[PDB]
Amino acid sequence: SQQVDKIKASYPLFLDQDYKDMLAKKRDGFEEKYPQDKIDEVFQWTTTKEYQELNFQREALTVNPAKACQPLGAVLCALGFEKTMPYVHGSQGCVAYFRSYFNRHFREPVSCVSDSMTEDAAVFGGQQNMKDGLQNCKATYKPDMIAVSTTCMAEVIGDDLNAFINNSKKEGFIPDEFPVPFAHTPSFVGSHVTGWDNMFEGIARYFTLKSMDDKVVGSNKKINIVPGFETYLGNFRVIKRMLSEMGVGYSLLSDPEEVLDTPADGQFRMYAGGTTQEEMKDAPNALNTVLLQPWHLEKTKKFVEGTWKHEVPKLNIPMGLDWTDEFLMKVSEISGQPIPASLTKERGRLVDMMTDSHTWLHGKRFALWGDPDFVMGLVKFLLELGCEPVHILCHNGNKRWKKAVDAILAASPYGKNATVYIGKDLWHLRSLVFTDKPDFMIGNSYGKFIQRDTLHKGKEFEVPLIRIGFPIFDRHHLHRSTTLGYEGAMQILTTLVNSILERLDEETRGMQATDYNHDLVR
Amino acid sequence: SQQVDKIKASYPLFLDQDYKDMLAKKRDGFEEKYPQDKIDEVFQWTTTKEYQELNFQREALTVNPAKACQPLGAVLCALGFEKTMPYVHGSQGCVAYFRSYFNRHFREPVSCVSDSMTEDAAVFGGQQNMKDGLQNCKATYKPDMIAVSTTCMAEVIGDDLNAFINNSKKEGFIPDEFPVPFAHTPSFVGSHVTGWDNMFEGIARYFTLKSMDDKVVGSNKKINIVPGFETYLGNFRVIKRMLSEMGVGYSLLSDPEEVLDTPADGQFRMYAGGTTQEEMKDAPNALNTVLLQPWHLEKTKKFVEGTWKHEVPKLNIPMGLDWTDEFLMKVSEISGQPIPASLTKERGRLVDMMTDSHTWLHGKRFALWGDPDFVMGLVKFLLELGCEPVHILCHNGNKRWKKAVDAILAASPYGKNATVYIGKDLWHLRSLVFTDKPDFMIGNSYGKFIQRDTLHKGKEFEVPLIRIGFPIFDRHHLHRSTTLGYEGAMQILTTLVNSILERLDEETRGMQATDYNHDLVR
Amino acid sequence: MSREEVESLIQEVLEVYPEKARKDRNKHLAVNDPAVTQSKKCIISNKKSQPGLMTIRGCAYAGSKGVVWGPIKDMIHISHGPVGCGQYSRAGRRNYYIGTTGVNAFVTMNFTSDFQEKDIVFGGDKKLAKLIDEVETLFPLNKGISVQSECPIGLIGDDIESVSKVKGAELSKTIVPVRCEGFRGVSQSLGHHIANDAVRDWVLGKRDEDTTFASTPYDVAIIGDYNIGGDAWSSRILLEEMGLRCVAQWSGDGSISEIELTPKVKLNLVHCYRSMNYISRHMEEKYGIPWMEYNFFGPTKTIESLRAIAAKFDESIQKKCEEVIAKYKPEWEAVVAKYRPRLEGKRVMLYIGGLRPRHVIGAYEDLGMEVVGTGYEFAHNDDYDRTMKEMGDSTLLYDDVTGYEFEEFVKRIKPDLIGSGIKEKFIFQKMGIPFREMHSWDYSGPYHGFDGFAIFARDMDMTLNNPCWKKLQAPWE
Amino acid sequence: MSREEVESLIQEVLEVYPEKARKDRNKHLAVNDPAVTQSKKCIISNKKSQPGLMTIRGCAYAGSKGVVWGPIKDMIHISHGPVGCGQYSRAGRRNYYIGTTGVNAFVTMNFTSDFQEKDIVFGGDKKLAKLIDEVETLFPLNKGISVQSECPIGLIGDDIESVSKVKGAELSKTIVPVRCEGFRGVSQSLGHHIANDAVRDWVLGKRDEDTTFASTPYDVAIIGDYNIGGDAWSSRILLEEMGLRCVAQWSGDGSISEIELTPKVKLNLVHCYRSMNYISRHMEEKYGIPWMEYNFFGPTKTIESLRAIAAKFDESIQKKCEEVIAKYKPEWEAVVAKYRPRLEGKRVMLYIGGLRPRHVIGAYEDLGMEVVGTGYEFAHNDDYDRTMKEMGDSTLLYDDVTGYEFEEFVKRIKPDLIGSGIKEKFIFQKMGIPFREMHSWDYSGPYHGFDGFAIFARDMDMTLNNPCWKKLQAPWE
């Protein structure tokens, strides 16, 4: 039943007595559900150390992974160029899933097309699909550039992107002058960050490789910035603002911040802003190229050093205090522009925040996961605050990245209890947080379920989740936040310290039981 | 006992068995504590409507007030001018309390002096105290200006500020040309916002009243902005940024954002930034003067219209979409500067955020409290979101403000269940949230206890608190947030929607009981 | 109205396509005529999408793993292949269930084989077998395994049925191989078909020789209800008040035991004809169980459906049906009285997958709201035969509508509300039109039954009459 | 260090003051000599502050309401006057307690008369009587009412003792008027004195004729412990393990019943001599109860104090004291072994109120840390008499030190750590020096006893050796 004045959604409508009775009747009659004591015993067993060893003995089964496939990163890279349509050669289900993922994260329209290859394409290839798709896309959505990536179907059947695009141009399906950069993005290799890297390398090669004769390094007095797979608009904004404050000419390649943050004024803008083709063409003339996330931009680094002849600096991701400082020093050295007083004041403000919150941040144990550059930057920042990262997990990381993170940890006394796991999933992390309980988790929305499991063991065993990373589905507008630079560090510090304080307030709200510590001032 | 590897603070050290037993025998032996059933019955009685009727019959007793006294606002106003020392004529305990309050809110050094008036000054006055204090303050802390306010002792004994300052100047204790503006701030009249108004009126009169002969309105092509009692640095920053984006010359009077947000670079800056004396002297040359919080700037408005001859516009606080639009239009009309495209894009982005979060924000019931302008702006924004303010409380409001808020509520269908209370305290609000439970509270840190009280009645009766306002003691770095303009609206919207989502996640975390609604995507 | 105007609009929208694409798309757009009962002469459906036109359709893997097999709670479903598909489809569908996740229920978890280059080159049958071993090791309370294939599995020739048979024999467990490669078919409909065939072949007939279950003359099985936000529950309780016994529930909050016990029921109540008509017809031929379609959207449809179900049983069930209708009459009458004045005269455009574009029309009309256009992602010509009689004259019908097409149709028609998926939501919100997700109920619900009608009306009113839609224009613009 | 350098520093700091202020402040700064016993010959304390010098001192209302009367939980304390006083002092002091807040305990609550213009002009005695009636109506479980006067109450002709007398007689309740007007005295010390006189006059002697309480030769009363962060609790348990019975603790987690029962105890254990030596001496004179000081800061002071209290009793208590010392020896030994190497050689400077500047020196020395400077906001000459023999040679002593003075001294001596209140915390933090709040224990604690020693060492280590202090200089500047 429903009351017209107070209508209940699923929660709490299904906790009504009639619904509870009907559910119990269904379960007792036709489910053949295991007895509750058996369920509790099995859950308790899954919370033990022997189950953890059995879980870490996994080699073939992946449970709750923390990575996506390459064409997702390829689409994100393609969305960062002016009037550019992402075009995934293969099946349309992949494109539907990519659009759903990006829509649920950004809450913004995401444009992407496919040529909808079917079994006929599996038997005879997808050249006709590519031709018809390019013609239809250009005729309908009128893009200035079509950026082609691939699904696994095309990669397995070995579709030749170069031959297909060339034949489409020669047969007149698209104009010969129309830019159609392409990239092979096999989903069985790497993750979405690798797809972003491949797509960027393809676009840069298309716009540069044949025009290196007239290029002189340092001619346009600019610095190239390659952001990589980035899902926080605040990071693009903060990098642009910091470079503008220092008085440094720059060219931010693959900037999607406008198309993912369009205004709601009564009209739908399919394209908005983005890196221009002139910027891509003039990129080799820059002084140098800086990769914000070098641990998944290796192919781009190889192409830039080999072709553009740019001495790409060895810089970590500009996260935290020391690494942001190093990035600023390097950019000042390359450009010759001194660091202004505004950035010094912002850095001092961040240090003041650290000194204010150090008493609450010290000694906290965190289990964190995400992308390699993001994870290593977060670990560095946590070590800057006196926190103790305990379980560091990166599903798409490699051995070199693990060695670098181990070297970072060995440089701080707060990293003595830290262990880095690569190739592991969130079920491994569930076992780890059950056996070696940290104070908090840091990661994407998928960690919420883990917290639920911990709360089933007990309130004293619950591990609260802090949502930093990608994707965040259960919260609104967190994608507008910043993680890079001093502003990003300030945001992360505020979020962490307030999470600690909120948990402490929750634990001491019990009246006449634990409220002696329910302090007004913290 | 303590474990050297895991040392416990008060919580949860006092939850140990020995401590619980020692508390037990203490209570059973020497406290003569009332029986527990009596305590539960009395608490339950305090949660009823009859207790509410008795509570609202209060005439002489104030329980848990939500306001401070005038000299606090006077000190905050004085801190906003260049190298200006706040000087409170009266007793030093008041200054200690003011400094402690402001340090606990801003987590920053707060400078203020007193003349330490004692019993003798009750029969002789504070002339000698004023002279010696002015001399000592100028000699030691070297300010360019000393802004004098008063405590209640001086107000009750009727110390003449003008005569005291004039005699101190005449007898050589301070130079005759040294600016010493003064203001009477009786604590038994109004609240801290009234003290801010009085202090600003005193400073403006001191710097203008005798030099209005050569002043021509609109000669300097600037717009004066009077912020009022403000405790969010982000609002000063956002007003500056919005006026700079519009290309509008402005003079922000009483700007404390720098001295309350100094960097930590190894040196202590007692003074930082602030409104200059030349700005105060040239203020009459401005085109017009805009009061951001008119409901506690009535005396300043009277002085500005009477002396400066400025036609102060009738503008509400620039909180939320419509009122920010009105403020921007008025500034455009006054200055002749058209609204740029950046502000239009920011407004459209705020509208997009509203359209994204409207499903979760609609129908929510809020009990909010704070200052009059802040409360009315928050109510307007909540009505823009489809939310339902139910208990609107303003301890320092008046009848005209109540009528204005009632007119605002009557202009929206979402204000049908809204009641405005003036002169009431947080005990009244506790009764209200017990008898007519809203979804959330919005207010300062003092509301946390109310939440605790509700949690004692039951988890289904708990009312979560959202910390917007002043003061915030139990959280870190919230004073850097923004409440004005589109940026402030975006921050408020994100905070509200994420509070709703966090409460929903907490309510549906129990396994096999309520987890069917523990959705990954919201 | 103005059928000629709608036809001219269709032509103007189609003008931008190339010749072949325009010719193909002309057959998928139509002007409704209720007198016509043969939609094949009016529209065409269930055909391949035009390349590069931003279609909204999914794949067969979405229709099998995400739609049919996924809600089954006591089963472990392995996304055999690379990591992307299971990750994108993990917990994206709000098929509610009751259970301890990770112990006895596994709906919201992502099991995958995580194919690498070595698995592509050398195969993955050994990986699949030893993965099944690990699954039995770590999740002892699972009541069966399904293996949903992705595109490479069909491409590289992995022999998963043999592996499933051998491992199931060796562990005495039900292992169901499903060949739901995304390239098969043109949409999720073939995924539905493949999942139904898998259920028929490997699960449905396991208790053919078992005659232990006690049967009553009032045994019904709810087929095709996936418990989005709880809809199935909100339906089942009504069937419980009518005197019927719901033995099985497919597949939302469904158990493999319910699927096994389904052939023992006396009647099948198919909610989603599109997804489970295959299994319903197979049950009709093999076991003689009659089936009927029903609709619980809005008071009128639910009352009519309840009377129709009561007609297939004796007089006691009819008396109980009249009792339940009388009991629930005041609630929906009050809901109508509160919300119909706020929604009278509002025009709606719909675009959902294969059932809801026609099932929700009655609920909208119960609030005095008219639908000026509908369409389907993947429906067949029988679905259009059904919906063409449920719309008014000169209303727009679209099959596999593209983003540009749908946007232009909205710009011309200008409806008051649009109901589609997440991929159209923000597009249409930025154009100043209220939007409701009709797949996930915009994270609200249920909408089925008398209890769901109140939620539906409240959501429609809160979105249609929201102040946010009146503030899209700057006062200075 | 280098006595002559310290005098030169004192002179250089003093040069900036005018002649009167400089002459006054010269008497409040001293170079400590442990041989000197009479502190009157070196430093002058408990004098009026110089106007306009940014002192840290509070008022008598803070010393009475905030310090003595406030922690009493079952009493309702009315801040009679304008609204600011209670609001600034509400829950600012971490005097912990156990109770149902708003029902049987009222510590974190703000009760005030909220004086307006009409109350200033025409008085507030009638408002006071009405307020007492409302308090009895709304809080029936309160066990007494105190009325703390603010500045206007003393200034205007309010007569609150008469009102308290009549209302208490009518209501059969204890109503205690306290004249703690902030202009009385020069600091919180006179507030302490006035509160002690109020306790003596109105509360302490109510059970003089009552002899129903059972007495034990091991009855002790904790005096001057206000349970900051649970400090008193961490002490009481130790006194419970020695075989003693603690009838009362004043006043943190204190009840009016404990205050009434105190004259029945056999020994008084005065923690804070400064605040409640008056009541201790009055009890000694009137009831013959001996009193003695104790120190539970650090293992050495705690062990010495426990041995002294045991010596005040018979042989069994001494034996139990030996067992408790042996039982707690390994714990603090492990704490020392873990934390002393990380804190060896660190120099500290302290500026706290009346007791803590000297009471915490032993704990720092137990970790190998030297106090090079100390001072008091409001102490008397006896506190300094104790401090000189507590401190080392050539260390600085300051009384009512000003902000400029303290900053200059810190910049010259350059300590590794500073312990003071909130008003100096951020000032010294921006200069790059670790800071610990010694009033509220920086929202940590307890620091008393063996359990508190671990927390003290951990806090000192985490603040002293924090990385944040190594990052105040930008690499480019």
Ligand code: ICS
């Ligand atoms: S009462 Fe006194 S200032 Fe003895 S007014 Fe003050 S809780 Fe201090 S050095 Mo705050 S004489 Fe207590 C004190 Fe010491 S408030 Fe606390 S820390 S031991």
Ligand code: CLF
């Ligand atoms: S020295 Fe002490 S704290 Fe000061 S007033 Fe006097 S008792 Fe109180 Fe009170 S309301 Fe405000 S804070 Fe004062 S000006 Fe009066």
Ligand code: CLF
């Ligand atoms: S049509 Fe459907 S969703 Fe597409 S792959 Fe095929 S079953 Fe799957 Fe999978 S890993 Fe990524 S998302 Fe594809 S490119 Fe392959």
Ligand SMILES: [Fe+3]
């Ligand atoms: Fe959006």
Ligand SMILES: [Fe+3]
């Ligand atoms: Fe600070």
